[PDB]
Design a binder for these strands. Structure first.
Ligand SMILES: [Mg+2]
Ligand SMILES: [Mg+2]
Ligand SMILES: [Mg+2]
Ligand SMILES: [Mg+2]
Ligand SMILES: [Mg+2]
Ligand SMILES: [Mg+2]
Ligand SMILES: [Mg+2]
Ligand SMILES: [Mg+2]
Ligand SMILES: [Zn+2]
Lengths: 69, 25, 181, 83, 120
RNA sequence: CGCCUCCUAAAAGGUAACGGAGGCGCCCAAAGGUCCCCUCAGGCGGGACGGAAAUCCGCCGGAGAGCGCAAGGGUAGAAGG
RNA sequence: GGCGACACACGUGCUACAAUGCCCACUACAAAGCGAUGCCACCCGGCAACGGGGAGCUAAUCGCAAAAAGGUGGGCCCAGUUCGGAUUGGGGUCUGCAACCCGACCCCAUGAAGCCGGAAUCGCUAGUAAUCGCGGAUCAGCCAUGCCGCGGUGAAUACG
């Protein structure tokens, strides 16, 4: 490349919120992070993350069918 | 906060009770 | 030569799977990931060359190699841009420096896009290549939020030796790109 | 709103006709002078006309409109712009 | 800390710094600190990182916020749209909804006073 | 009213009219010498702030770009960058 | 259905623009009125509106009813910032046959404009100005920040 102007690439170990140790060579020797390829909800299964709701309960608001038959 | 529903004297001004001004001694 | 993970992940996961799915008969008929390009287009640097050096330092911090300017080729009346006036900052990525950047991107930076609903799989040119753009630079773990100044973001051009769009689709998906279905 | 200790749709005027037309099919238009009708989810797929003060507005029904009343789909005021 | 997606709090006393999160107020933050077991009166300069991780795996999981509370509210507005609903048409014309006086000032909802030529 | 470019100009040169159309009376120490390197304008798709074109990515494009300035000749196997 | 419509304009009021300030926990100090189709002590359930029981009261003996500012302690560190709440979504309480174009409340989260207001203009000469809360009328409920009374702390100035 060109010498003296380009940065140097050092071993970089990224620690995650779940404790994942990511194994790269980069421009800072130890990295803190808060996500990885596993904690992001789109990556792995999506596991009814926060919703458990098909919609708001439009056709499900009945809460007891109480009328005259 | 005489109009704020989530402070003390807003509940005192309208005379309504709840979390932010309960009546208990 | 280096023990970068996505290169070996390519060779042992995505390289035979693309032979299996499409029926390749030569080892170089597989799609190959070469010449990742970043142009970080700073059209807001018409009046200032001092933001350009900080953006060059940040780009050299996140990819390991220092970008070049892009000189304007053609002046316009609406947007000042006379002859020169450097308002761009282009860097291309090769030879284990695209791979560490793709590790950074796919594992850290893309989950730090806000709500990150997926990608656009319709963003294919027709001849095996792909382009995407980033909004903020704080998604990369090398950007520190206390050495930052401004809301400077990115356009990434990734090139593949694939002939069609469906080949690069399966190469990007299996190597770790989070497209929408 | 209506208290959840009690029910909803206290109008036996409209319930009889909509349940008879549910059991019969043949999705015929019914004209009702009752905006206080909170729409039962059995009313999905019927042409209901609500009288808003001058005229009836024909209201097609799909699955999404349940807790809304029928006057929430019946405008009683026409403005058309300041100028 | 680096807790609510990428929009972060810092700087002096989490018990009001959690209130800056879109979807985390004061009493919800009090519930979050009561179940986690952390000091309200401590500050975010000086705390254990395990407290941070436990606060994260509390708050970004047990409620919805970050970049989808805005999506839920916008989808609820579009739910009110497109059908002929009254409050959706009030949201359409830029007009207030919850039984308001619009003869005089509704300029919270309407915008600035668009002062007109005012005949007679 | 002097000079330059095309036509009138009848395929060498030349050729008039108060004939048809345009300019020039400057500039460049880099817009010169040499050496080395690069090839345009557009069109089709793709891409944060980018819209018909601020910058980039892939394909087609023998010269329609450019060559300071009017026009002509010429030119990418360079005189262009 | 309308008197609540709204691109605007005017008058009268409420809440603020903060540190003589805000929030939280505890602790005091009144006056004037109201109520057996009602006022509800006190328990249980709910973070809460409130609900289920049920004592008392024809009421200077019962209840409304905590009065607030005040006082003690702690937190906020002056930044559109736990000042300020507009506005908006969801979930609930009471009334009324019915609360959507038209209610009042409770909870969550959004949390705006406003960091002292141009020409001008208003009230006040002693408990008066200012500030703070309470009760009545109507009223099934209530848009009551309106009106009428009640009391707590308590200025400044008036050469002419
Ligand atoms: Mg070397
Ligand atoms: Mg928030
Ligand atoms: Mg000749
Ligand atoms: Mg001749
Ligand atoms: Mg001339
Ligand atoms: Mg394009
Ligand atoms: Mg020329
Ligand atoms: Mg009126
Ligand atoms: Zn993780």
């Amino acid at each position: 490349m060109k010498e003296g102007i380009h940065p140097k690439l050092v071993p970089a170990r990224i620690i995650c919120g779940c404790g994942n140790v990511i194994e790269t060579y980069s421009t800072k020797p130890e990295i803190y992070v808060e996500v990885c390829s596993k904690c992001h909800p789109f990556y792995t299964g999506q596991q009814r993350f926060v919703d458990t709701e098909g919609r708001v309960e439009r056709f499900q608001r009945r809460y007891g069918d109480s009328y005259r038959k | 906060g005489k109009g704020d529903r989530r402070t003390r004297r807003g509940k005192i001004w309208r005379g309504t009770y709840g979390k932010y001004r309960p009546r208990k001694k | 030569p280096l023990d970068v993970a996505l290169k070996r992940k390519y060779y042992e996961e995505v390289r035979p799977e693309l032979i299996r799915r499409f029926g390749y008969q030569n080892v170089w008929e597989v799609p190959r990931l070469e010449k990742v390009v970043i142009n970080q287009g700073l059209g807001e640097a018409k009046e200032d060359a001092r933001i350009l050096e900080k953006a060059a330092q940040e780009l050299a911090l996140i990819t390991g190699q220092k970008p070049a300017v892009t000189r304007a080729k053609k002046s316009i009346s609406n947007f000042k841009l006379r002859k020169g006036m450097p308002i761009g900052l282009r860097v291309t990525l090769r030879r284990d420096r695209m791979w560490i950047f793709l590790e950074k991107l796919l594992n850290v930076a893309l989950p730090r896009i806000r709500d990150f609903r997926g990608l656009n799989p319709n963003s294919f040119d027709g001849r095996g290549n792909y382009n995407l753009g980033l909004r903020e630079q704080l998604i990369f773990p090398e950007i520190t939020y206390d050495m930052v100044d401004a809301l400077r973001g990115m356009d990434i051009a990734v090139v593949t030796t694939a002939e069609t769009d469906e080949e690069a689709r399966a190469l990007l998906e299996l190597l770790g790109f989070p497209f929408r279905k | 709103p209506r208290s959840l200790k009690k029910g909803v749709f206290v109008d036996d005027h409209l319930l009889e006709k909509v349940l008879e037309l549910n059991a019969k099919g043949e999705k015929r238009l019914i004209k009702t002078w009752s905006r206080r009708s909170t729409i039962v989810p059995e009313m999905v797929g019927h042409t209901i006309a609500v009288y808003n003060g001058k005229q009836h507005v024909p209201v097609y029904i799909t699955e999404n409109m349940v807790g809304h009343k029928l006057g929430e789909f019946a405008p009683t005021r026409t403005y058309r712009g300041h100028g | 800390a680096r807790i609510a997606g990428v929009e972060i709090p810092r700087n002096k006393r989490v018990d009001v710094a959690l209130t800056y999160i879109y979807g985390i107020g004061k009493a919800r933050a009090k519930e979050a600190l009561e179940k986690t077991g952390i000091n309200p009166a401590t500050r975010v300069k000086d705390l254990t990182e395990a407290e941070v991780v436990r606060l994260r795996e509390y708050v970004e999981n047990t409620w919805k916020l970050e970049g989808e509370l805005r999506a839920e509210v916008a989808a609820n507005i579009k739910r009110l749209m497109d059908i002929g609903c009254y409050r959706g048409l009030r949201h359409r014309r830029g007009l207030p909804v919850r039984g308001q006086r619009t003869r005089t000032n509704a300029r919270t909802r309407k915008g600035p006073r668009k002062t007109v030529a005012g005949k007679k």
